[PDB]
Amino acid sequence: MIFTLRPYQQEAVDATLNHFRRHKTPAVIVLPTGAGKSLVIAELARLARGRVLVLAHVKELVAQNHAKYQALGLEADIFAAGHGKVVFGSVQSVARNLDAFQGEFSLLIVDECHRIGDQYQQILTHLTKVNPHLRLLGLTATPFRLGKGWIYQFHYHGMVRGDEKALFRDCIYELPLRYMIKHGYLTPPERLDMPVVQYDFSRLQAQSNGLFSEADLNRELKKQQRITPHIISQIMEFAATRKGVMIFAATVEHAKEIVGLLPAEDAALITGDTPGAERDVLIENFKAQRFRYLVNVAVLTTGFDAPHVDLIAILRPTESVSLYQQIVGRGLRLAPGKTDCLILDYAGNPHDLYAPEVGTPKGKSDNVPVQVFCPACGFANTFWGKTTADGTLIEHFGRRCQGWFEDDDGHREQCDFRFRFKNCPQCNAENDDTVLVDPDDMLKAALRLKDALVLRCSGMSLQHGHDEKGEWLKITYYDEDGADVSERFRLQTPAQRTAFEQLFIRPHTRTPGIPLRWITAADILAQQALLRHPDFVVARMKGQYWQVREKVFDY
Ligand SMILES: Nc1ncnc2c1ncn2[C@@H]1O[C@H](COP(=O)(O)OP(=O)(O)OP(O)(O)=S)[C@@H](O)[C@H]1O
Ligand SMILES: [Zn+2]
């Protein structure tokens, strides 16, 4: 025709076609920010019946998307303040003019589809009303943002990222950032091997969601504000050998500090508090290099992502790779004679540009991604864990296999293998279909009763021995005030060592799914750092000595 697709662009067309030939449900394609997303929109539209509508929420992403589409030598329309086979509209402008969209429409593409949470469902109702079989494809460079969840639920590689509540049931294609860089479709990123002054944010604890707080951050900074223009110095140095420098501070009160730097008119701080009549006095100044330094709160973008950008200075710690790969990618575009984008990583971010995304909040700040094979389906999950020097698993915090599979009878389901269990994952209802009781409610019931003991567990000690019937292992749970409660396990018969693995190791192990190797009770004491202790123990006076009836783990 008029254009030629790259081998990865046909896969995204071919994947979107094979999906809509099978399923009527929406889908999403994950794409980098230098991928050439207009070429997929154009081929999909070349093969379409009726019309194709390319929505977007922010206006400049519409106008820019259209500029990128027509720049292919093709004809299309626009809907904003400003009838064709393809239309480029914005949610707000399209939602008041539904009278122009009454013909056949076979595809609706939603650019930056992660932003469907911030109207739009009025278009989805109208279109779906004229076109009952309208197909929905969304596009995005970030399908996951910490504190918001995921956009899709099922990934075509075989795992599960969200749940029934996700907007898009499926992600049918993903273009890795590693790939794009490997084959030159993207500028290569160089990290300054080591910087002499960075910050240290280990003395910080994320909130419940997983994101650090506006308060907690400017308090770790002030304690080191004596290290800041020693940093901007390094940043200042080679920021003369680059046409564009983007900086991401920890916040606004971190920008004002790091805004200067250079008394430029300007270095011109973008933030989430200006139009769009201001986004505009510096869009077109930065995209034209007026104005070289650009600092951000930030999220942020989704403009000012200009090809000429060739230096990324990380002035905030990244909680998830998705945000690090999101930042670093803002400046990986292709530009005439731009051999690389250098990344100056202050502030304690690892060199993990291709690390997998566990997609859950870390927890312990020293956690890292570890991979555990599912004993049922063999799917290799990525959980939060802690490894030693040689890459050996010490602990992992996954609870259920995240893989899924489908039968030739259409039925699709997630692997029901539980790494942490009562009789299913922590929840309200399985038989143990009775309403499950709550750990707090069970503690309260046993506190309110004598012949019962409820001790906060501070640790446990193991002892072993034997007699004419083989060995045994005695475990003793103790208080921070010396309160004891014990239980004993015989390890002699196969029905006895089997129960021991069933009743004591699977709940107490730190790497469930990975079995403990042992021959005698001695091999179990050797590895007692592989075992954790309950958080609460509940015991009933059944014999005149205390007997254990409940252990509470991960409270
Ligand atoms: N299929 C293609 N064939 C030839 N050149 C391409 C193709 N796709 C992209 N390019 C070129 O590579 C550069 C990167 O693509 P862009 O046009 O920036 O993609 P875009 O859709 O504008 O933005 P995204 O986020 O990457 S989809 C562009 O300047 C194009 O000239
Ligand atoms: Zn599994």
79 is written with which tokens?
A: 């809907």
Cβ atoms of 373 and 350 within 8 Å: the answer is no
In this structure, are 217 and 87 located in the same domain? no
Ligand 2 centroid to Cα of residue 404, in Å, is 7
In this structure, are 170 and 274 located in the same domain? no
Instruction: Please tell me whether residue 42 adopts helix, strand or coil conformation.
Output: helix
Instruction: Please tell me whether residue 93 adopts helix, strand or coil conformation.
Output: helix
CA distance 180 to 355: 15
Residue 232 half-sphere exposure toward CB, CA atoms < 13 A: 21
CA distance 268 to 258: 11
Which residue is associated with the tokens 């402008």?
A: 93
Instruction: Please tell me whether residue 522 adopts helix, strand or coil conformation.
Output: helix
Looking at ligand 1, which residue's alpha carbon is closest to its atom 5? 36
In this structure, are 200 and 327 located in the same domain? yes
CA distance 98 to 100: 5
Alpha helix (H) residue ranges in 31-119: 38-46, 59-70, 91-94
In this structure, are 125 and 160 located in the same domain? yes
Cβ atoms of 70 and 2 within 8 Å: the answer is no
Ligand-binding annotation for 401, yes or no, is: yes
Resolution in A: 3.0
In this structure, are 220 and 317 located in the same domain? yes
Distances (CA, A) of 6 to 11, 26, 240: 9, 24, 35
Around ion ligand 2, which residues have CB less than 5 A away? 374, 376-377, 379, 401, 403, 415, 417
Q: Which ligand is nearest to the CA of 335?
A: 1
In this structure, are 310 and 284 located in the same domain? yes
Amino acid, single-letter form, for residue 393: L
The verdict on whether omega for the bond into residue 276 sits within 30 degrees of 0, i.e. cis, is: yes
Ligand 1 centroid to Cα of residue 455, in Å, is 63
CA distance 378 to 376: 6
Q: Which ligand is nearest to the CA of 329?
A: 1
CA distance 4 to 12: 14
CA distance 38 to 33: 11
- The pair phi, psi for residue 310, each rounded to 5°, is -135, 20
In this structure, are 167 and 193 located in the same domain? no
Residue whose C-alpha is closest to residue 309's, from 327, 291, 287, 290? 287
Of 1, 58, 68, 187, the residue with max ligand 1 atoms within 8 A of its CB, to mutate for a pocket test, comes to 68
Residue whose C-alpha is closest to residue 344's, from 293, 286, 268, 272? 293
- Method of determination? X-ray
Q: Which ligand is nearest to the CA of 41?
A: 1
326 is written with which tokens?
A: 């999101």
Ligand-binding annotation for 457, yes or no, is: no
Residue whose C-alpha is closest to residue 427's, from 417, 438, 415? 438
CA 211 to chain centre: 12
Kindly calculate the radius of gyration of the chain based on its CA atoms and give it in whole angstroms: 28
CA distance 533 to 387: 19
Looking at ligand 1, which residue's alpha carbon is closest to its atom 26? 34
First-last CA distance in the chain:
62
In this structure, are 68 and 131 located in the same domain? yes
User: Which distant-in-sequence residues (6+ apart) come within 8 Å of 449 by Cβ?
Assistant: none
Residue whose C-alpha is closest to residue 176's, from 193, 155, 192? 155
DSSP codes, 153-222: EEETTSBB-S-TT-SEEEEEEE--HHHHHHTTSSPPEEE-S--S------S----SSS---HHHHHHHHH
In this structure, are 115 and 240 located in the same domain? no
Ligand-binding annotation for 171, yes or no, is: no
Which residue is associated with the tokens 């014990």?
A: 486
Which residue is associated with the tokens 């429409």?
A: 105
Residues with CB under 6 A from ligand 1: 4-6, 9, 31, 33-39, 68, 334
| Max Cα-Cα span within the chain | 93
Cβ atoms of 114 and 145 within 8 Å: the answer is yes
* Residue 1: Cβ within 10 Å count: 10
Cβ atoms of 453 and 550 within 8 Å: the answer is no
At 60, which CATH number? 3.40.50.300
In this structure, are 76 and 207 located in the same domain? no
In this structure, are 255 and 277 located in the same domain? yes
Domain that holds residue 337: 183-345
In this structure, are 164 and 205 located in the same domain? no
Kindly provide the residue ranges of all beta strands, DSSP E only, lying in 360-467, ordered along the sequence: 368-373, 380-387, 393-396, 404-406, 412-414, 452-456, 459-467
Q: What is the DSSP letter of 353?
A: S
Ligand 1 centroid to Cα of residue 506, in Å, is 51
